Design a binder for this molecule. Structure first.
Ligand SMILES: Cc1cc2nc3c(=O)[nH]c(=O)nc-3n(C[C@H](O)[C@H](O)[C@H](O)COP(=O)(O)OP(=O)(O)OC[C@H]3O[C@@H](n4cnc5c(N)ncnc54)[C@H](O)[C@@H]3O)c2cc1C
Ligand code: HEC
Ligand code: HEC
Ligand code: HEC
Ligand code: F3S
Lengths: 97, 418, 537, 45
């Protein structure tokens, strides 16, 4: 019951590539935070083919750890790691990635 | 500049004659380590009471090419006189101008070579020298190879003495000419094989990669550390570009001399993609010290200041003897007064002092995930390096038990006469 | 347990004294409350610290708190420090016990004081001036600067600043983007933004690498480019001295001549251990030196050690800080560089010091991606709209402080309290802090200036703090002075009655000044180096 | 007056300090006596 957690949201709506099994350690922890976790996560796959316009309950499995829909979002101008002239006149401005 | 200067630059004749950077160059005091002990190098400035101001052309040449001090004793073979022997008699007097005219006399005593058991008696070296066949008919410019190649055999062998650190030694601590430029461990470090062997040398290195390594010491697949950091920043970088092209040419011509069990040239050994799980863990205990400058995938920085651990000639060697010195002492070059440095991680380290066990794990992780997976580090392959490498089979003689036993056994032959 | 000299506190000050002493011959012992903490372990702690503690700066969580003699905390508090007074929030300042001292975490801004600040009372008629003058301290500034490997803006003439008779060992690393943009716009406004001298390596130094903008420079720097007390402690310990972790000191023994001759110190499990040495040194903290002196009230000493004027634990000082936070108009891209690069030094001196306090505007260069990402998450966004919000709020984030110079007012004090104990039963110290109308008027002016900077950037969502914030460096607590009856220590760092007690700590200063100031702490600790040697030679 | 060091015990577990004759029973201590012994033969010549 992991391929229904990695595949849950999208490529674009989240990391296009994998979590790199950092969700296979999330899923274990969501078992303890929610016993019914592995139950609803299947039920949110067919419904995109109520269920969170007010039921924000599954955002917590999409917020998180930071996972700000992330090793981060915008790494081409900032640090957490990069080379000593990190300064290069700020590079780009809003050319996303 | 001056021709006499150029030879000392090429001959590296100041890497040994000034203790540390801060010393007064050509003054002596750099105690080069050795199995026998810590020989202390001697003043060479033309000082009339301390240096070699009293030396003449024939007294100089005997020292340089035959290792005989002025008053008669034998100079210790810490000299590359076995590499300086074949030097032309013209260049030997060219050095002579530079030392007598160019450099500035300095008035200081130079600490003397305090050696243990009989290695402390100098005169026996003439017995040693004849065993090492070091008299070699000074260099005559060959003709079947163009002057670009001739200089290469003249810089690699005589002037810069690449061998005196690279080519291994025999039981009697003498040059071992069967494996010529094939790589013996040098105290702590280990000079890698630099023959033309494709998967086991530098014959696979790109030509413009090999020139770029020697000139500066920085390249994508190899960064010079240790005794090359002391050789590149002291001699090679100052050589005019035409000279290195000779060394580059000759290095391509040396016959290959292979290694025990290699499968890919040291700089192609790509690494498994893995990471750790966000002490006592090669995957964590690396990410908590090494992953800040490099990255978690070992690929390094994005422009090169932090070398990629993947496909690195210090990782991808079957002998991890270098990669344990690089962790233990860090790397410290200075080319064009831009020093690139890596903190030491040894016992007396100052950024983070790792333990003799811990370095192995990180050394063992890097090898498994980036280096030759066949090549591995035991927890005590590191204590050897911190001590100075495995004892060559001659230093065993310098412990009083090993001689006392040779004493009575030696005397017991006297009674056998009767 | 004995040696020629005992020093307690393996921080910047104690470690510099240790290294100098051992370099000059006399053996040494170091005793520090914390354990031997290694930089890599601290980095691993910080990486896994939850991004709420990174969003708003926590500087103590990655350093795990020992339970016996802990260090302070302010994300949900452990209540080690209790602070009282109208501006109690201002003194909620954190320290980190352990070998290396609190200097394990510090933006390493190492300033020189002005020459006025040593003659403050003799110049403006407020506060109390130091015992010596800057001319009598300059050599120790330069020795400390060489030993810590301090950077500097060598090739420049700036602003009110100490006269330099000797160039900084290195030269300033070039500004990132935030600092260039800030200095340009604030030059447009009318203020001067000049680089902060720092203890980073802008070129490799001392055998540790060059700063590469890890930008983790306050909590912990993973590679060692900046300076920590642990370097001096390591150099001294390898040079021949001895260091003992967890050695909490709680009582000191004396004669009727009041010369220190013994101390009993707990190990973690209350077992007493006794130490005898020719000369004793207390270098704990601006907070933990007065607490220890109050705790060891003796049969000879009813109310406190060296308390002949009733001033130990009194006159507590620290720079009160006003914060700010908004979004610039054009991007700032804060984060490239170190955590503390520039500063508005334009105000550090003038004719107003007799009327109100001299400020030092600056700003904070720590990266915004953490906080901005969390803010955009908690705005309940989703998808590419969320990602765009994260990028905007991290390329526009801004953070500005405005410290102040606080006067020493004796109504402030460090009554060691009763309501709280620990695993040793030693009191949790409690501080009474009041700021004074001096800094009240100064802080009104600072609020105006901060709002003006916010407008100059076109700031939106400007959220100033209303309450003064701490700045983590403790000044005052054992004031120096010539007359023994109105000041504890003398112009040579030797407690008046205890002719054998040397107090090398930030409590010794008589003025809070305007600048991050452990360099003077470290360049008065090296003052006590010669006082000890000449008296024991 | 009599005290035990932490390694006065490892000697006992091993069997006590080696008497000065058992040192002979290790191949290095004889090989050295070998060549030294042979080196007296050449001294005859
Ligand atoms: C966020 C931050 C910002 C900073 N900014 C600056 C700046 O701008 N400029 C600057 O110059 N510096 C700055 N600093 C550094 C600070 O000024 C110094 O680190 C400080 O002055 C030195 O303190 P320490 O770590 O040496 O204390 P320590 O050396 O750790 O003190 C330990 C001592 O306390 C004693 N002790 C502990 N508990 C007890 C007890 N219960 N009873 C008795 N004794 C006890 C121990 O015995 C030991 O002697 C900053 C630090 C931080 C955290
Ligand atoms: C390190 C590998 C060295 C290099 C490179 C050079 N020299 Fe040297 N030299 C070295 C040692 C360790 C010693 C003394 C050892 C011994 O057996 O006594 C010497 C000694 C000399 C001497 C003898 C005169 C004197 O030492 O007072 C001379 C004339 C000398 N060295 C010259 C010399 C020159 C000219 C070099 C550059 C071509 C040179 N040495 C390089 C160590 C090393
Ligand atoms: C930055 C402070 C570093 C940290 C921490 C570590 N390494 Fe490093 N390393 C760094 C530099 C800048 C360099 C090369 C300098 C140059 O001029 O290129 C290196 C080099 C190495 C090497 C060998 C490279 C070579 O010899 O060609 C190795 C094997 C290596 N580093 C490994 C390593 C390990 C195991 C570390 C943690 C114990 C580690 N590095 C940390 C910079 C930094
Ligand atoms: C002893 C002082 C040496 C001298 C003289 C020369 N070399 Fe060397 N070499 C030496 C060391 C200690 C090392 C690296 C050690 C480590 O573990 O990293 C090297 C390495 C090289 C290499 C790279 C080989 C590889 O990494 O696979 C090259 C190409 C090389 N050295 C060339 C070279 C030349 C041409 C020399 C004569 C001018 C020379 N070295 C001298 C040791 C020493
Ligand atoms: S972590 Fe250290 S590397 Fe520099 S930018 Fe920060 S002081």
């Amino acid at each position: 019951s992991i391929s229904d957690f990695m595949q849950l949201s999208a490529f674009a709506t989240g990391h296009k590539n994998l979590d790199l099994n950092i969700g296979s350690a999330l899923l274990l922890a969501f078992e303890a935070q929610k016993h019914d976790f592995s139950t609803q996560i299947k039920a949110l796959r067919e419904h995109i083919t109520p269920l969170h316009p007010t039921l924000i309950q599954i955002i917590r499995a999409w917020y998180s750890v930071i996972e700000d829909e992330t090793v981060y979002a915008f790494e081409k101008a900032l640090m957490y790691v990069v080379v000593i002239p990190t300064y290069a006149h700020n590079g780009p401005n809003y050319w996303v990635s | 500049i001056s021709r006499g200067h150029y030879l000392a630059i090429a001959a590296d004749c100041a890497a040994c004659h000034t203790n540390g950077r801060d010393g007064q160059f050509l003054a002596g005091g750099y105690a080069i380590s050795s199995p026998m002990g810590n020989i202390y190098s001697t003043n060479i400035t033309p000082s009339k009471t301390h240096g070699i101001g009293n030396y003449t052309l024939e007294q100089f040449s005997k020292a340089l090419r035959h290792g005989i001090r002025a008053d008669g004793a034998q100079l210790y073979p810490a000299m590359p006189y076995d590499a300086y022997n074949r030097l032309t008699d013209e260049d030997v007097k060219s050095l002579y101008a530079y030392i007598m005219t160019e450099v500035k006399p300095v008035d200081a005593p130079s600490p003397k070579t305090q050696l243990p058991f009989p290695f402390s008696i100098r005169a026996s070296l003439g017995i040693w020298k004849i065993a090492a066949r070091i008299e070699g008919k000074p260099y005559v410019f060959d003709h079947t190879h163009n002057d670009d190649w001739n200089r290469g055999r003249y810089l690699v062998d005589e002037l810069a003495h690449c061998g005196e650190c690279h080519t291994p030694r025999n039981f009697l601590l003498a040059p071992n000419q069967s494996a010529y430029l094939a790589g013996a461990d040098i105290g702590s470090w280990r000079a890698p094989n630099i023959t033309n062997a494709p998967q086991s040398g530098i014959g696979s290195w790109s030509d413009q990669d090999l020139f770029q390594y020697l000139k500066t010491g920085k390249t994508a697949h190899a960064r010079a550390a240790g005794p090359m950091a002391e050789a590149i920043e002291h001699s090679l970088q100052y050589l005019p570009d035409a000279d290195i092209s000779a060394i580059v040419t000759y290095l391509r011509s040396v016959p290959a001399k292979a290694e025990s069990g290699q499968t890919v040239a040291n700089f192609e050994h790509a690494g498994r993609p893995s990471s750790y799980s966000v002490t006592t863990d090669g995957a964590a205990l690396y990410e908590a010290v090494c992953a800040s400058c490099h990255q978690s995938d070992g690929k390094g920085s994005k422009d090169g200041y932090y070398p990629s651990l993947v496909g690195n000639t210090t990782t991808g060697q079957l002998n991890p003897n270098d990669l344990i010195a690089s962790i233990l002492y860090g790397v410290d070059r200075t080319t064009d007064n831009h020093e690139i440095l890596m903190p030491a991680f040894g016992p007396d380290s100052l950024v983070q002092p790792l333990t003799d066990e811990q370095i192995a794990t990180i050394a063992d992780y890097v090898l498994s995930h980036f280096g030759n997976a066949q090549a591995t580090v035991s927890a005590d392959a590191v204590k050897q390096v911190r001590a100075g490498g495995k004892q060559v089979p001659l230093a065993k003689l310098a412990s009083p038990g090993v001689m006392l036993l040779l004493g009575t056994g030696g005397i017991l032959g006297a009674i056998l006469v009767v | 347990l004995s040696a020629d000299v005992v020093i307690i506190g393996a921080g910047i000050c104690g470690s510099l004294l240790a290294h100098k002493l051992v370099r000059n011959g006399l053996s040494v012992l170091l005793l520090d409350a914390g354990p031997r903490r290694d930089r890599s372990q601290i980095v691993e702690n910080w990486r896994n610290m939850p991004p709420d503690n990174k969003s708003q700066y926590d500087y103590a969580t990655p350093y795990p708190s020992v339970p016996w003699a802990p260090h302070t905390n302010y994300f949900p508090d452990n209540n080690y420090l209790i602070v009282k007074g109208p501006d109690r929030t201002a003194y909620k300042q954190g320290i980190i016990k352990g070998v290396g001292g609190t200097t394990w975490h510090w933006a390493a801004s190492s300033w020189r004081y002005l020459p006025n600040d040593f003659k403050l009372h003799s110049t403006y008629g407020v506060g109390r001036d130091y015992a010596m003058s800057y001319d009598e301290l300059e050599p120790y500034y330069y020795e400390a600067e060489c030993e810590m490997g301090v950077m500097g803006p060598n090739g420049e003439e700036i602003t009110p600043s100490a006269p330099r008779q000797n160039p900084w060992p290195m030269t300033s690393m070039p500004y990132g983007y935030g600092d260039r943009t800030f200095t340009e716009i604030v030059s447009k406004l009318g203020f001067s933004n000049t680089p902060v001298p720092q203890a980073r390596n802008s070129r490799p130094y001392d055998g540790r690498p060059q700063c590469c903008g890890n930008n983790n420079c306050m909590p912990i720097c993973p590679i060692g480019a900046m300076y920590n007390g642990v370097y001096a402690a390591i150099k001294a310990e390898k040079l021949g001295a001895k260091i003992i972790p967890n050695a909490v000191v709680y009582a000191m023994e004396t004669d009727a001549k009041n010369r220190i001759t013994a101390i009993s110190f707990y190990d973690p499990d209350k077992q007493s251990h006794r130490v005898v040495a020719k000369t004793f040194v207390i270098a704990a903290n601006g907070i933990e030196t007065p607490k220890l002196l109050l705790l060891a009230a003796n049969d000879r000493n009813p109310h406190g050690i060296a308390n002949s004027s009733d001033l130990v634990g009194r006159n507590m000082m620290d720079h009160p800080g006003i914060g700010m936070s908004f979004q610039s108009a054009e991007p700032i891209w804060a984060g490239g560089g170190s955590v503390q690069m520039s500063s508005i030094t334009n105000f550090r001196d003038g004719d107003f010091r007799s009327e109100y306090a001299a400020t030092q505007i600056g700003y904070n260069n720590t990266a915004q991606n953490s906080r901005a990402g969390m803010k955009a998450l908690s705005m309940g966004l989703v998808g590419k709209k969320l990602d765009e919000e994260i990028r905007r709020r991290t390329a526009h984030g801004v953070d500005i402080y405005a410290n102040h110079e606080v006067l020493p007012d004796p109504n402030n004090r460090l009554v060691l309290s009763k309501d709280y104990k620990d695993a040793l039963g030693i009191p949790h110290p409690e501080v009474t802090y009041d700021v004074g109308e001096y800094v009240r008027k100064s802080a009104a002016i600072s609020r105006q200036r901060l709002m003006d900077i916010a407008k100059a950037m076109g700031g939106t969502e400007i959220e100033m703090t209303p309450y003064f914030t701490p700045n983590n460096h403790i000044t005052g607590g054992t004031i120096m002075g010539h007359d023994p009856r109105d000041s504890v220590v003398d112009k040579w760092l030797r407690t008046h009655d205890h002719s054998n007690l040397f107090l090398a700590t930030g409590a010794t200063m008589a003025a809070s000044g305007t600048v991050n100031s452990t360099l003077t702490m470290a360049a008065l600790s090296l003052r006590a180096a010669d006082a000890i040697l000449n008296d024991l030679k």
